Structure 1
């Protein structure tokens, strides 16, 4: 593969920090070296000395004097080596990517820890998009990506979707405006990428099937575009057995996958990871290097010590317990919607994630009902408008989270929603 045609001139221009050259010759000269090249502050000046963090169904995490000095000090841009190696083994175990042993220039599998999955996505979008570029996605889409894409001046082409996610026939019809050979033509504008959330799409809750993923992949090869697999709900699927990912079928080295620990381990710690072809991951690490420098060393060490103690088994056992909690929350929100919203609204059972996407029946726009009227009654829900490229267009939809509210809180919230819908239905 040739990755240069996908990236911007600014991304290609990025150079590594001069400290990398010193790090390369660190293991090339003697072992007991004196380093005056560095810019690392003296760790002994830092006021935090030791840390003890208690874990539920796990051994207490302890940072002694030496471990605390490491946790409070600068660390590599791509992430700490022990976290990177554990995550690489996890990706091999779960996805067995065809690119593991490819040459670096051919899209060899590479990983990098990011300050949440949002950072990975943001740096990936900025690395690729020139104004006027064509990108593909299915609307309604995650507001965070629409808000990232909007300032980049790309044309967002909406791909049709249903309860099983993106409709491959719709993607096929959209692509027919070009010929496969246009992808090699510098003056043709074939799509740079397809962006999708394959499990529990935010905000619909819909997931792609294996069959559809294979057809989509086949179209990505034919018209030579990348696939940005934003999969933060991969570890939050309600159905038994995880569906194979785009990364698992990536023979071409065309997939960039974002994984998140936000719903399973911690959202506040800002630790996610990106998996993709080495030349593209390298461009992302270089942009991260001049922005955050690296993700928090302390937070990485907390997560790394937890994952190593748990092992792959302990991690999977924890995700099962988390899925079980969200599955019970999903049943409770579905029972509340059946009770108060039957005949007033329409909804599908979410396949993954923490959201219920609700279509209000006899209202063109739910925005004032949700942003004003519901808030004054003490109930917060998100209007559907936020999940479309054209947010000014009227939306009869709303997104309801089932992550934390109790069944009684859901009962009160849905009773309020029903009351407001009824009020709106009476106004001619």
Structure 2
């Protein structure tokens, strides 16, 4: 409602940047207009001329001469228009955000294609955080998010979490340190935002429930902080019905959502997108304008043509094939764990994503059990230390990936792990 509270002085100071009044006064004027004002290099010099890309369960994608010249040239900072338009309709279909027709100044929904979802997240953190600011999140958390927040000098306040994600009662108790009106008084530093991964948290695999999301949103309104919904496993949920998102209930315009195609379409193409209130999305776009400039035009056109041929039906059919694969992988790793973890460890069933979070019994720290003993036995799993702000503290947890391993490999790996646990007790 007052977005200036969430924008640093540096971010607010940004002004719009190049490739400007050249391809817009010419994108509506007469076809007889001569322009020597643009800053585009001549694309006829570029060496790639055509492309043919085959697609499984889809029409082959072809870039002819003219399309290739577009794919190899600069494009708009927020993304190419046909991809932005498709993605906007997808967000309306999946989330029907309340903010679609709000005035810009009070949070009109806006989208930005980013060079991966983490780029959007990083620029959002940089947009908001002054040194000393307080921010809320639940540990264990994605190590990359922790490493992104560390140099910004914010105080990370841990919110309790269990098998159903963030525990609202813990958030409420933490927030009771302040009065709601303190949010309009920056002297004692009410939290600027809550960050969470609401589906298939990396590393835990746990997901938030609908009732808790509603409680959390009410707290975000009461103490007027933003919700940063980092949802890269949104399309990798094993439940038949997806839990409503924070975006879908965001009547205030206080949610910034990051979506990713890295798990379902491609991680290497570096294409994700942000959805959020226009004043905040605009600050991110302005930062992109002086940084990457835009996501690869070529990769955007690959994805946009794929998605347009698929339609929303073909897209959802693809996600359902991917869910089917990962859910079978999940069943397989759970079977191996049931077989070989013998009351030697505890674990919750992942609700989404690609990781199993294992607590080993009777051992206080497992990085020595793995990085020393397990490595020479030919098995590797990741100690949980890296997913806490204080990574030097001992952790009895391991993160095991089921994205790729065959059932045989899982059986072997957990046999080895079981032996090591038993001979280490």
Would you say the 8 A contact 2:23–2:38 is kept in 1? no
**How far apart are 1:31 and its partner, in Å?**
3.5
- Contact 2:359 2:397 (C-alpha < 8 Å) held by counterparts: yes
Moved more, 335-344 or 307-316: 335-344
The answer (yes or no) to whether the contact 2:200–2:207 under 8 Å persists in 1 is: yes
> What SS does the aligned partner of 2:98 have?
coil
> Comparing 127-136 with 16-25, which one deviates more in the overlay?
16-25
Distance 1:21 1:371 in 2: 57
Deviation at 1:243, TM superposition (A): 0.7
Structure 1 position 104, deviation (Å): 0.6
> Residue 157 of structure 2: SS of its match in structure 1?
strand
Separation in structure 2 between the aligned mates of residue 329 and residue 88 of structure 1, nearest angstrom:
32
The 3-state SS of whatever aligns with 2:5 is: coil
Which deviates the most, 298-307 or 21-30? 21-30
CA distance in structure 1 between the aligned counterparts of 2:371 and 2:143, rounded to whole angstroms = 16
What's the offset of the Cα at 1:321? 0.5
Alpha-carbon distance, 1:85 to partner: 0.3
Q: Deviations over 1:331-390 (max 9, x none)?
A: 000001111112111000000000000001011000122223222222221110010000
Pick closer, same or farther for the CA change 1:18–1:288 going to 2, 3 Å.
closer
Separation in 1, partners of 2:283, 2:24: 19
1:32 aligns with 2:62: no
Residue aligned with 1:389, SS: coil
The alignment's C-alpha RMSD in Å is: 1.0
Match of 2:194, SS state, is: strand
Structure 1 length normalisation: TM-score?
Answer: 0.97
Q: Structure 2 CA distance, aligned partners of 1:153 and 1:213?
A: 28
Give yes or no for contact 2:18–2:289 (8 Å, CA) kept in 1.
no
Give the whole-Å Cα distance in 2 for the aligned partners of 1:230 and 1:76: 24
Offset at residue 421 of structure 1 (A): 1.2
Distance in 2 between residues matched to 1:207 and 1:316, nearest whole Å: 21
Gaps of 5+ in 2: none
| Deviation sequence 1:18-38 (CA, Å, 0-9, x none) | 432334433464343222222
Tell me the residue number matched to 1:205. 205
String of CA shifts for 1:31-56, please: whole Å, max 9, x gaps: 43222222211111111111101000
* 2:72/2:297 contact within 8 Å kept: yes
What is the aligned residue count? 424
1:13 and 1:60 map into 2 onto residues whose CA distance is: 45
For the residue of structure 2 that corresponds to 1:112, the secondary structure is strand
8 Å CA contact 2:74, 2:297 repeated in 1: yes
Shift of 1:218: 0.2
- Secondary structure in 2 aligned to 1:19? coil
* Unpaired runs of at least 5, structure 1: none
Q: Distance in 2 between matches of 1:343 and 1:156?
A: 34
Check whether the contact 2:59–2:309 (CA below 8 A) recurs between aligned residues.
yes
Task: Measure the CA separation in 1 of the matches of 2:372 and 2:31.
Answer: 66
Summarize the alignment of residues 91-130 of structure 1 with structure 2, pairs less than 5 Å apart: 91-130=91-130
- Whole-angstrom CA distance in 2 between matches of 1:260 and 1:138: 20
Of 180-189 and 373-382, the range deviating more from structure 2:
373-382
Worse overlay, 245-254 or 409-418 = 409-418
**Matched residue, 1:53:** 53
1:50-109 Cα deviation digits (max 9, x unpaired):
110100010000001111111111111101100000000000011010000001111100
Deviation >4 Å, runs of 4+: none
Q: Give the whole-Å Cα distance in 2 for the aligned partners of 1:256 and 1:82.
A: 22
Structure 1 residues 99-144: Cα deviation after superposition (integer angstroms, max 9, x where no partner): 0000111110000001111101101001101000000000000111
Matched with 1:177 is 177
SS at match of 2:374: helix
SS, match of residue 256 in structure 2: strand
Equivalents in 2 of 1:86, 1:206: separation in Å?
30
* Conservation of the 8 A alpha-carbon contact between 2:14 and 2:287: yes
Q: State the match for 1:382 in structure 2.
A: 382
Distance in 1 (CA, whole Å) between partners of 2:102 and 2:50 is 42
Q: Select between 61-70 and 369-378 the one with higher mean Cα deviation.
A: 369-378
| Inter-partner Cα distance in structure 2 for 1:207 and 1:32 | 57
Residues 120 and 284 in structure 2, CA contact (< 8 A), matched pair in contact too: yes
> Secondary structure, in 3 states, of the residue corresponding to 1:195?
strand
Q: What is the alpha-carbon distance in structure 1 between the residues aligned to residue 372 and residue 34 of structure 2?
A: 64
Residue 343 of structure 1: SS of its match in structure 2?
coil
Q: 1:18 to 1:327 in 2, by over 3 A?
A: closer
